[model samples]
Every structure is written in structure tokens, then in C-alpha cells.
Target: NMDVIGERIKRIKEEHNSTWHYDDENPYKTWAYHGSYEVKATSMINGVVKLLTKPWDVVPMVTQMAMTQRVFKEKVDTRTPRPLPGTRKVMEITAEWLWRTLGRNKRPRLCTREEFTKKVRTNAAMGAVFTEENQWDSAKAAVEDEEFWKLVDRERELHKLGKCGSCVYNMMGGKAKGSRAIWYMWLGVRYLEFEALGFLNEDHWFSRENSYSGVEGEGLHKLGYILRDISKIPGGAMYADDTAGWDTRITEDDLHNEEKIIQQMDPEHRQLANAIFKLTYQNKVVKVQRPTPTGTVMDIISRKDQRGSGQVGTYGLNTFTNMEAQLVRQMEGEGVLTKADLENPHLLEKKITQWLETKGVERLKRMAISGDDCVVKPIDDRFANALLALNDMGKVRKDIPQWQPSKGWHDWQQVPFCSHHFHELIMKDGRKLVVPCRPQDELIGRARISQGAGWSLRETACLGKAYAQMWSLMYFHRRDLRLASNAICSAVPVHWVPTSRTTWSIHAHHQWMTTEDMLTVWNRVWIEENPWMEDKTPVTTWENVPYLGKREDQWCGSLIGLTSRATWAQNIPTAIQQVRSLIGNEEFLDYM
Candidate 1:
């Protein structure tokens, strides 16, 4: 007893040291702390008095549904009758085209290819943004938010197709949906889907289909990662999935990386470049492959790859790549280096990373964004406004910024964005509720894997999938919600269809819904979803009773459908009105 008690005393002492020591890397306290503090500040500022005041925080409720969905899936997978497997891109090129355009315009002569890669990937490569988290911060802020127009202009049966009231709106509203002669001889998707399937069911009870021999799809991979990572994330408004941490601390003494490049410049250039580095986001690094005898990879440039300089914010590999590309091309066009130097890479990876590291370099090259030749320009007014117009639904459209249809559904400028901005919105009593801009993939999600080159490839595959489902609003907001965030009184038309089903498809013609209706449905779905929150996980097996075939309750699996219904709950309503007002242009107004 004395020995055990003495051992406990020692353990307590050790625990105190571990807990109390200056452990700056504490994720719950430092980088994570900032997010926690911000929420507290927001609550105090906004005067949030109730338990459910912030719909975004209603996670365990919705996640409870997500958890229950898995129970049915487990039961479904083990069944003798295979679980009903009903179902589930292009535009990749135009997306790349726009990204190249964006990089060309943004990267300065001194910036590196790595920098460009990070920035372009986050902002444009994926798709357009509703101001995209102050990518420039010029002016996407809400100046005012009013329902200004009290009347919700409503028009019914604009099309004379009097088919039963089953079909929704058209992205096409169609080339004269009013053509009545075809009613008896209709040949349309809705006719085959709705009329043939029946108004209530709108679906055939198709047989279990055969699996394809070979096919590459985006979701199996993405969802794989989201699945494992979802439960690991702590409850809060977290973003940048796997990549969340405090930025490197910057100080006057720690300016070596920026200062080193300046020192490397022979004599006269050193002082001039040093002043440049101290002022802004500038890095000079280049890999010159000496074709001569040694034929070795050498730097025409080098600075700190991970910068603590400038306004510190989290970023990923794209930033590094973009900045590098801009640096090389700008320098070469004006004869900073001949055509030969820029064409380079790893002798496969160790070589690539080795060439990238500026370890032994005593001095670095002159790289500066403010150089006379390298100009940083904002996206054009029309182009920028158009970028902020991305709504949810058509993902293919989101990435292609400059392209849009002149009329009909594809006319991006004519469609409404989201019902509201997810982060900031003014409340009814004049206080403002605010959340920080957290790009889900940047710090945690996509950005994490990207940081590694060949050295990371094996580990990355090992990392496999850590995807969190959309029911987690943080993940959803960065992907889908952020796109269609600017709503006024209405939500996404997710509720227009039946709440749960085995198969589903978007009815092109979606409509607005009241916030109250959206809220009521959301609360209802979660309570119904989480009922098994305290359920017994029975292990009956073959013990004590005869074996019975185990088939999942269909409704249990359907609980996962709550994501579409509760999606609108992410909003701070006043924030929506403000975003529409701030970012809304004439084309935006016309669409509204």
C-alpha cells in the first residue's frame, strides 16, 4: 500500500511538470485558442443569450444523425440481401485555364512557383468565391443589410406545362416550357422521372445494380478522408481540416530568412534588397541548372520557404508554387535569367527537395514584390464581382470564373448567391455576430498532404482518407455553404423534396423558403435522428436465441439526409442580407 501510494505521488508530480511547463505547442491553447477566443468575443458582442441562439453550433444534434446513419450502414453491409445500392465532371480544363490566368496576373517577378501554387489552388483553382475570405480584402464587407423590398415577388406556372405539381424550377426554366402541345407527347427528364415514377414516389424501385469493372471517381477518395477525420475533430467552428496551428512567431531578431536573401546579394544589391524584404511579402529563390561540367542544381535565388514575415495567415502549397512561377517568368521576360534556367525540377524528389532547401546558402538572391517590374494588381471590377456570384448546385460553374451563359440558368450573373455570408452578419437588435474566415482545406484538409513532395508520397497514401461528412458545417461551409451563403429570408430549396430517400437528384428549379420553416424542419430532423443516442448496442449473435436475418431499418440509414435539410441553419440571417447588399451588383440585383 505504501509503495503504491508513493508511486501515485511521483506520477502526480510528473503530471504537474508536463502540464505546467511552457508547452507553446499546445493545440488547444495556441492556434486553437485563437478560434475559441474569437467565438467567445463574438457571443459577448452579439449578446447571444439563449442555448440555441447560434444555429451553427447545433452540431452534436446533427452529427448524432450522421452517427446513426453508420449503424444502419453496418447492418446493411452484413445483410444476406445486399444493401440497396442506388447510386451516385468535366470542366476540369476551364478551371485550369482560369487558374493560369489568375496566376499570370498575380505573381510578381520575385515570387516563386510554389507561392503561386498555394494561392491559385485555394482561391481560383477550386472555384469562385463570395469575396473568398478577403483574398484581397478590398471591399466585400457589408455596408448595410435591409429587406429593403418587403414584397417577395412571386409568379406561379410561368410555364404552361400543367404537369402534376411534382417538378421544381429549371436552371433553363426551359426554351418555352409553356409550349402546351407537348403535354400528351412529352419527352423530358421530368416526364421520365416524375410522371413515369409517379408523383409521390418519383422513383422506380430499381434492382440492385452490378458494380463497374473499373472507374475513377472523385467521391470515394474524398469521402474516404472526410470519414475518418470527422470524428477526430473537436466540436467548435473549426476550419482548414488537418492543417490547424498557430503561425510561426515573428520578431526583429528572427528576420534571418528574409534578411539572408538581401545579404547574399554581392555588395550594393544587398542593402537595397534588404529594405525590400522588410517592407512586404517578398522572397527571392530560383533553381538554376548549370548545364556546364558540374551540371548541378543551383540557386539563382533563395529565402525562407515558410515565411513568418508579412501579415501572418495560414496558407498551403499553392501559395508557394504560384509565387515561384510568377517570380521565374517575370524575371526571365526582362532577362533576369535566360530561358534555360527556369526549366527545372527534382531528379525525381529527394533531388527536388534537396534543390529546394536553401540550407548551406550563405546569402540569398534579390526577390521583391514591390520591384518596378513586378506589379500586384487587383482583379478587374467586373471580374471580381462576377466571382462573388457563385451559388451552390452546379460545381462545374464555380471554378470557371470568366465563363457564363448569356441567358437562362447558366447565366451566373443572373442567379442569386447564397442566402447569407456564413461568417459575419448583423443581428436584428443592431449587434453583429461574427466568425473568423476559416478555409477548411488550407490549414487542415488539402493543404496538409500537399506540403510534402516525394518524401511525403508514401506517408500520404498511408494517411489515406480522413474526410468529415458535410453534416459537419465547418467542412460543408468551406465546400458548399460558402458558395451559396448569401440568402435573405429564404434558404436553399433543400426542403422542397421528401426529407429522406434511397435515391435523390436536384430538381433544377429550386425556390426560396422562410427561415422559420427551415429552422423547424432542422430541429425536427435532428431529434428524430439522434433518438438512438442512448440506444443499446446489442451483441446477441447466436447466444441465448435463434438466429434471425439482420436487415437495417431503412429510416435509420435515411437520417444522413438531414445534411440537405439543415444546411441553411449555418446562416446568421443578418449576415446574408449584408453580403447581398455589399457584394450584390446590378446583375445580382436583376437576378434577385
Candidate 2:
């Protein structure tokens, strides 16, 4: 009868099937994907394998073995009945029975035959090779069989249950819910068994027989221990459990709310908020706040109430009010009475006009008229042209007398002397008398100087030669009116060189030379004669002429110095060299 019962259970387990479902009432209908189907099927297979391999009798014996090991530090008592061993033997016997029974039939039971063969192979392989030494190879080979595959499925289902349980637990501070409530159910059943055996009371089994309170705690603790043990089993640990632990349950209300929330948020925000909510729920805390007024309410509830004293309101309102008042005061301070400001504005206009006239307009008018006619023309071209022409002619005429002193000075210095004993002096020694002396000097000193014996005859001879050459150059020239004009004009200071024709030479010979040429020759003679005359007789010296030797020398020296070091020295060679060896010989010659 027991064999028949076991066969029936196995048949039911093999035929069991799960179907996909969706919440159609939800706004966003929550549907199960292929992964969910695969998971559920795998979980059912896992449950069947656990039941078949372990059996009900082994549960308490294993618990007692575990407890004895913990209390007495001993190995499990082999003398005690081990239902797992008996169940394994029974499964092997059943597999053999099913194989033999199927082989006898004319048409084989395809599923039963496959399952029976796989179970026989797995058990045989475990018996032959899965000792401590070959356990790894045995397990690896055994896992390739259909029975091992079924066991894998069972493991996967338990993994899903644990994962779902953990999610539910996190929801209820570590408890189970919905389908995952099986963990708690199994724990409760295990606790009831312990109570029946007098090992513990129901309360003691829940609270004292194991750590923590209730069957949920015991289940979680067992699951945790299973996970930890599996993790140490080399490759036994399952990773699908981790992924399955994520929230997958969806009700109509939850889906509708999710769809509404998703519709309210942007795509990016929706994804972010979903992830935030998932993480928060996994951590057993409030998920991301909804994008609704309820979110504000929740925030308000979560906040520590600090508004009761009115401190923030008083500070913020008073500060803002004061700031507004200050701003208004500043604006008021800057406000103007436009009507008052406009009153008597004409008086200000008159004052501004007077100020402008005194500071600028009057001075500008005076400057406008004060310049030379040429300069004035640029300021006022029409009237300036006429004025300029007349002014230029006036200037020309005004300068005429000064330029041609022949007409003027002749009347003053020569006219009276022309008829009055225009004396010619002869040196008594007959050495061609050459010195430029006045008629009185010649008459008074010629005889006296010729008669003097201690007159330093050596120096006297050199002076005599120079005097002859000078007299011939001067007196030998023709005395035409033009020559007279040239001589007078040329005698004027070089800075005052004449520009007018009235002062120019009229004679044929003198007219050939330009005013500049005449000035050049005159300046040369004047400078040479001036130094000599100053040394000889102070009365004949022309040192008093403005910009002649001293002033011209100063100006020329300064100009040369400003140009280049070599040029500066060259212009005044003797003075520059005496002070410093500043000029090159070539520069000196060239400039001089």
C-alpha cells in the first residue's frame, strides 16, 4: 500500500503544471513573461525532488542530529533511524520497480521510464563514486542525469521561494507572504513536529527552541543557513535567487497606480523614480514620493516640526519687510519734484551762457583775430585772403629800407664824405699800403708808424703783406650803384637777409649772385674779420650784432650736439676736442 501511495505521489508530481497569469484589472496590465513560467516550473520540480529524496521521517532526525552536535560536540548518532537513507533506498527501489514495470508493458510509459532510468543511474553513481575522495567527480556526473536535473529544478524552486520570502520578509520586517508563505508554513509544521515529540512547546519552538520569534523568523534563519551552507559547497550556491528576490508581484491596484504615476512623470524621471522606489522597498523603507500633493504631505509628516515658535516666519518676514522699506526709502530719497526743478530754468540757462562766454567764447574770438593773416585765413578764409595780401605787401615795403641800407645809409654815411676829401692813404715805405683804416688814422698814423724803429719789423712785414692783399680785393672792385647796393645789403646781419628786390643789387656783376650766395660770402667775411678786429681794435669789433659770433656759435653747437655725437663734435671741432676726443677727423672735416 505504501509503495502504491509513493507511486501515486510521484505520478502526480510528474504531471503537475503551472500557467502564466496577468492582472487585467490594472491600468498597465501586469503580465508574466517566459522567465516567470520557467521559474515556477523549476520550483515545482524542486519541491518534488526534495520530497522524494528526503521524505518526512528524516526531518526530525536531522534536527535532532543537529541539536546533539551543537549541545554535545559529537557526530550524528548512526544508531538513530535515518529516514533520508530509507527514502533514498525506497526511491531506488521504486525507480527499479518502475523500470521493470515499464519494460514489461508492450507500450512504454515515456515520462516514467525516463525518470526511473535517471534515478537508478544517479543512485548507482552516488553509491559507486561519491565517497569523500571522489565526491566531486561523482557529483559532477550525477548532475548530468535527469534525476539530478530534477533535483536542480527543486533547488531553483526553493531558491525562488527563499527570494520571494526575503522580499516579503523585508516588507514585514523579515517575514513571508503570498506563495512564499510556504517557508513559514514549513517552519510551523516543523515546529509542530518538535512539539509532538516533546522536544519543545509551540511557543518554545517559535520563541525559545530557535533564535528570534515566530515561524517566520525560524524559516528565515533556516533559509539563511541553507544559503550560507550552499555558498560553501564549491558550486552549490544558486545566483537566480538573488535576481528572483526583486519585487515581481503586481495587483490590479498597484499596476493602475504605477501607470498613473508613470504617466505623470517624464520618461527619464519615471525610470529614476521606479529605481528609487524599488530600492527603497527592498530596504523596507518608504519608496520615492509620488509626484502629487500627497508627496508634500509625506514630506511634511517626515519633517521635524520647528514652525510652532514662529521663529522662521518672524525672521524671514521681518527681514524682507525691512529690506523692502529700505529700498523704498532709497527710491524716495532719489525722487525729484519735476515741476520745482523746471521753475526758473531760464536763469540757469543764462548763467551757463555767461560762464561759457567768460571761460571759452570770448578767448576764442580774441585768438581768432590775433594771428597773422595767413594763419587767420584757415580760421576765416574769405576775409583773411584780402587782408593777407595787403599785409604781405606792407611787410615787404617796410623791410625795404633796412634791407637796402645803401639808399638809406649812403645818405647818412657816404653822401657827406663823397665830396669832402675822400682821402687815399699811401704807406710811406711803398709796400702797397693795404690796411683798412679810416682817413684820419691813415693821415695821423702812416708817417708816425713808418718812422717808428722798434716796431717789431718781423711781425710788421707779415702784417704788411696781409694789408696789401685786403686793400686790392676791396678797392679794386668797380664802384657802380649796383655794387654799392650789394655792399650795403651784404653788410646787414645774416639773420636779416633781405627778401625784397628793393634791397637787391642792380649792377650786372652783383645781380648774378643770389641773396643766399651773398649772405654766405658776407657771413664768412664778417665772422673772420670780427674775431680779428676784436683782437686788434675793440672799436672795429661787430660783436654787438645779434646772433652773430657768440649767439650763432651757441645755436650751431647745440644743433650739432643734438644731431649725432660725431656731428656735434665736428661743428665745433676745437671746443669739442678740447673738452673730449668726441669727433672723428672725417666728420670734423665734412661738417666744417
Candidate 3:
């Protein structure tokens, strides 16, 4: 079983290196150096083939153990020194015996020469044979081979005594460059093996064969192991007495000796060692130390450091308190503030100051402090005489005949009974001329029309004039004056006044009435005048008329003139009621 497993191990190694893809071209070639191998075998004895196959199926423990032991023993033997010939005397004799036996047939016997019968007969008197049969004798006759063997023996003796002409101490120098001498020796042996195997046997291979074979398979494996072992040694001890000659007590003289020894080995190695030592020593000696001088420390301190001293000074609080004291003095001088005045002083002052800053001092002062009440004197007394005059005029106008415009020619009358009559003019022969007689009579009749039947007549006439005036103003003002005039006329109730063309004064009378009173009087007059309108659609024209009275105050002369003439359309009863409400009955009846 052991033999079988050993054979398997050898076969695995050979197959892995030879048959398997292990070259640089293979992707898994790194496994050649990284992989491991194992071998196992099993055996059994039986009476028949079937029985033998079924023999104790025990695990391959013996085979595994044996192969492991053999591999470990080979590994150990590689580093173990070979025994000297003295310790292997018996094996040495046995090898010599084999060499002699192998050379017996090829060995020369008794010598023969033909020199006695030739010119060499002088030495024949001593019984010298001259048949020329001894080849060793002929070769030695031309050279003194004994002296050569003596010189070789002397050199071997000197090497054994450690006194060979080479520098032995230099070989132990431990310089990295000279570290490969033993490596080259091993490579030479590998190359000789390769040559014996008839592999790459060329002149160049023979010349630097040592270096080539040094990196060959088996030699490389052994060199790797050697390097690994050397690296395991601590660096301190690596250069100490055990392997190297370095020591703590080493002086300049010792260093010189060491350098001399290195120089004798290889020039490149000598230079590298010297350079490394100088650089390492100089780096160790010139390093900085502590305890900075006062001058050096002062040089490092800058202007920023000097200014930092003021960071903790009393200047800030000193200036602030002094400014406060001066402000207090000034306030005391003004008599508005004093030490006693400060007692329980309101913090509200600070709040007020901040509020004023945010909202502005003007806004803060304008804030209302208290509610206010006011009484307005009545204007009834001032309007008393005017009301009486209006009443008198109304009474007088009641008997006067109201005027109506003469049909289409009157349509050209200026609306509202006010404003320049030029607006009533028509262009004749490229010149503006007034509608002379008709418009003047219409205006006078319109102004004096009674507050009853003439009220509607005046309203219609005034609205027509208002329309013309508003249209002229709006046309020049470019505003909607026609709509404004329509709104004002429609808003005043025409039905509340008598609608006779000669007497429409109620229209002007109703115009002066308050809106609520006007509406009330209008409702009554409308129901009385047009009883047929009951249950019919409430006249929408009156309802849709926007309150022109609402915008009466914004009117300038143009709109005021239009509305003033329009007041003639107010119903007499409605206007009297509004005036009587402002003035008492006794005062109001005096005017009637």
C-alpha cells in the first residue's frame, strides 16, 4: 500500500508539471506554485477475485500515513547535511569497489614499446621494453602528470584546512548582493543534470549555465525555502554575531574592516553597503531634539499674538459706562431726568422706544388715545327764507301758463334749461347759428313752469337740454354723458307730476324731494294716474334708473347745471314734505 501511494505521489508530481497546463500561457499556471498534492491507496487479499474486491473495506489510513511520512522525510533530508566519507566508510569502499570492477576491462596491462630496436636502445640495457603498447606511459612521457596531481592534492588540503587562497571571511559578510554565491553553486549542479538529460545542450547554455539553472524548477524551490528561512530570522540578530559580524561595541576601525572585507567580495555590493550605512547613520545622528531656545520661540510669535493680549482688556466696559454717565449728566441738566426721577421708572419706556423704532415715530404718535363726540348746529334757520321764497315762487307759478316746445323745432332746445344757448345752434352755411326764437321761449316757459302739470313738461324739456349739455360735455370729456342724462331723468318720477304739456311743474318739484320721500310720493301718484298699470309689470324703467342723486356731490358745473334744472320736475307735495321735515311746520307753513 505504501509503495502504491508513493508511486501515486511521484506520478502526481510528474503529471502536474508535464501533462497539466502549468506554463505561463495557462491562466491557472499560478496554481502550479500554489497547489498541494496528496496520495492514498488500498489493498486486500482474498480467495477469489470477488471476495478480494469485498475484502475489509477499511479506510486508506495506512497509505495516507505512509505517504505523509515519506514526503516529510524527503523534505527534512533536503536540508540535512550529507555524512562525510569517514562516517560512510563502508558505502565509500563499496562505491570504489564498483568503480574498479567497471574499469577492469578497460584498464591497461603490462607496458610494451619498440624503442629498444630503434634509436632508444641506449635505455634498453636496463631491460626497457619498446613495443609502444602502454598508452598511459606515452601520455605521461610528454608531461609531468605527477606534479599536476601533487598541486591538486595540495589545493584540496588547503581547502579542507580553511586556508584556501580565497577570502573565507568575505563569504560570510551577509551582503545581499553576494548572497547568491551558494545559489549559483546549486544552479551549476542543476545545469549539469539537465545536460546529462540531453536538454538544451548548447555552447551558450554551458557558458552562463549557472545563472540559467539557478531559476530552474528544483533549484528555484530550494532557493525559495532558503530565502524564506533567512527572512524568519529577526533583523536585529540577522546582523549580529550569530550570522553576521555586527555588534553594539563595533567601532570605526571595525566598520572599516568590514567594509574592506565587502570590497574584496564584489565592487557593486561594496558600494551599496557603504551607501546604505552612510545614509542610515547620518539620518540617525542629524535628527532634531527638544528644548527650543527663547529667541527661536520669540521669532515664531507674530503680530496677531501681540494684538490678542487686548482681547481681555477693560476698554469695552470702560467706554460704555463713561458714555452712560455723560448721558445721565446731560439728562439731569435738562431737568427732565434726575436720580430721584429714576425710582421705579417704567420699563415701558424701553418698550415704547423699540415699538416706535419698528412702527416709525410718526405712526406711534398718531395712534388714537380716546374716543370723541361732536354736535352739529342745524341749518334749518339759514334755509328758512330760501324755502319761503321757493314756496312763493311755486304759488305764483301755479297760475302761470306752462310752455311746451313747438314739436320738431323744439327738439333742438338745450336740455336742462341752463348753459350757453350756442349748443342749441345748428350749423348753417358753415357757421353755427342758434335756433333763435323757439329755444328762448321754451327755456323761459321751462324755468317758470308750475310744480303740478308743468313738472313733467319741465322734466322732459330739462332732460332734453341735459342730454344735449351732457352729450356736449361728454363728447368733449369723452365720457358717457347721454347715459348719465338718461339715468338722471328716468330716476325722477315724471308720472308723480301732472304730465300736461302746459303744466308739468310736479316733475321739477319731485326732483328736489329726498329719494325715499320721492319714491313714496311717486308710488301714490303712479297708482292714481295709471290705475290700469296695477297687476301689470311694475314699470321697469323707474326701478332700473340708477340713483343719479347718489353722485350729485361729484358733479362739476356741467352735471350740477343738468341736475339743478332737473329739480323743477320734483312733485310739489314731495318737495314740501322734505322741506317741512328739515324746518318745523310753523316755519315751513310761513313760506307756503
> Which lDDT tens digits does candidate 1 get at residues 1-592?
2221233223223433432222232222111111000000000111111111233233343323222210111221121211111100001111232224323322212222233234334433222211112222211111111111111000012112211211111110001122211111111212222211121111111100110100112111122222122223322111110111111222222233223323223443333233233322223121111122322211121222223211221121112222232222222223323223222221122322232243101101111111011111111112222211111101112223334421211221112211111232232333322221222222122212221133232222112111111112122223223222223112222112211111111111111112233323322322223231233222222121111111211111121235643554454454444433433332222101
lDDT of 3 by residue, 1-592 (tens): 2221233234334533532322232122111121222211111111111111111123243223222210111221121122222212212222232223222333211111222123224322212222121323332232223443344334334323322221111010001121123222222222221222111112111111221111122211122222223323322111100101111112222122222222232443344333322322111110001112221100000010001111111121111111222222222223323233333223124432332235222221111110010010111122111111111111111232322111111122221111221122212122221211112222322322222222333344333333222222212221123333233333333333312122122112222222223333333433333232233222233333122232322232222234433453233234434433432333211111
Please list the Cα RMSD from the true structure of every candidate, rounded to 1 decimal place.
30.9, 60.0, 65.8
Clashes of 2: 5
Taken over the whole model, the C-alpha lDDT of each candidate is: 0.21, 0.22, 0.23
lDDT per residue (tens digit) for residues 145-172 in model 2? 4554443344334333322111111110
Residue pairs in clash, model 2 = 43-157, 46-154, 169-174, 169-175, 434-467
Residue 137 accuracy (lDDT) in model 3 = 32
Best-matching candidate per TM-score? 1
- Kindly give the stretch of ten consecutive residues in candidate 3 with the minimal lDDT sum: 297-306
Each prediction's TM-score versus the true structure: 0.19, 0.10, 0.11
**TM-score of model number 3:** 0.11
Q: Candidate 1, residue 369: CA error in Å? A: 24
- Of 2 and 3, the candidate ranking higher by lDDT: 3
lDDT score, residue 559, model 1?
18
